[PDB]
Design a protein around this motif. Structure first.
Motif, PDB file in Angstrom:
ATOM      1  N   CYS A 161       0.821  -1.109  -0.021  1.00 43.23           N
ATOM      2  CA  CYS A 161       0.021   0.016   0.030  1.00 43.23           C
ATOM      3  C   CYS A 161       0.931   1.059  -0.002  1.00 43.23           C
ATOM      4  O   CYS A 161       0.415   2.351  -0.302  1.00 43.23           O
ATOM      5  CB  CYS A 161      -0.981  -0.037   1.306  1.00 43.23           C
ATOM      6  N   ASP A 168       2.043   0.308  -4.477  1.00 43.66           N
ATOM      7  CA  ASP A 168       0.668   0.316  -5.227  1.00 43.66           C
ATOM      8  C   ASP A 168      -0.422   0.222  -4.355  1.00 43.66           C
ATOM      9  O   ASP A 168      -0.989  -0.826  -3.738  1.00 43.66           O
ATOM     10  CB  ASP A 168       0.708  -0.994  -5.956  1.00 43.66           C
ATOM     11  N   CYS A 169      -1.244   1.358  -4.545  1.00 44.45           N
ATOM     12  CA  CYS A 169      -2.458   1.455  -3.677  1.00 44.45           C
ATOM     13  C   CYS A 169      -3.570   0.573  -4.273  1.00 44.45           C
ATOM     14  O   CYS A 169      -4.526   1.498  -4.893  1.00 44.45           O
ATOM     15  CB  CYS A 169      -2.749   2.683  -3.420  1.00 44.45           C
ATOM     16  N   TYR A 170      -3.490  -0.687  -4.551  1.00 40.01           N
ATOM     17  CA  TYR A 170      -4.586  -1.283  -5.333  1.00 40.01           C
ATOM     18  C   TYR A 170      -5.937  -1.266  -4.454  1.00 40.01           C
ATOM     19  O   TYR A 170      -5.745  -1.249  -3.254  1.00 40.01           O
ATOM     20  CB  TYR A 170      -4.277  -2.589  -5.870  1.00 40.01           C
ATOM     21  N   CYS A 218      -2.814   4.133   1.945  1.00 40.76           N
ATOM     22  CA  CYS A 218      -2.084   4.782   0.885  1.00 40.76           C
ATOM     23  C   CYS A 218      -2.105   6.259   0.784  1.00 40.76           C
ATOM     24  O   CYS A 218      -3.026   6.949   1.207  1.00 40.76           O
ATOM     25  CB  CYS A 218      -2.511   4.133  -0.367  1.00 40.76           C
TER      26      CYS A 218
END
Length: 31
Positions: free
Chosen positions: A12, A15-17, A25
């Motif tokens: 996070c 990559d703040c998926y 994030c």
């Protein structure tokens, strides 16, 4: 037992998926 980093998955930080919980994030997506 195993140690905990903190709370939010390191991923996070990068990559703040969608798997990233609220407020973890920086670049918050989806409004």
């Amino acid at each position: 037992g195993s140690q905990i980093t903190g709370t939010c998955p390191s991923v996070c930080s990068g990559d703040c998926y969608p798997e990233c919980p609220p407020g973890c994030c920086g670049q918050v997506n989806l409004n």
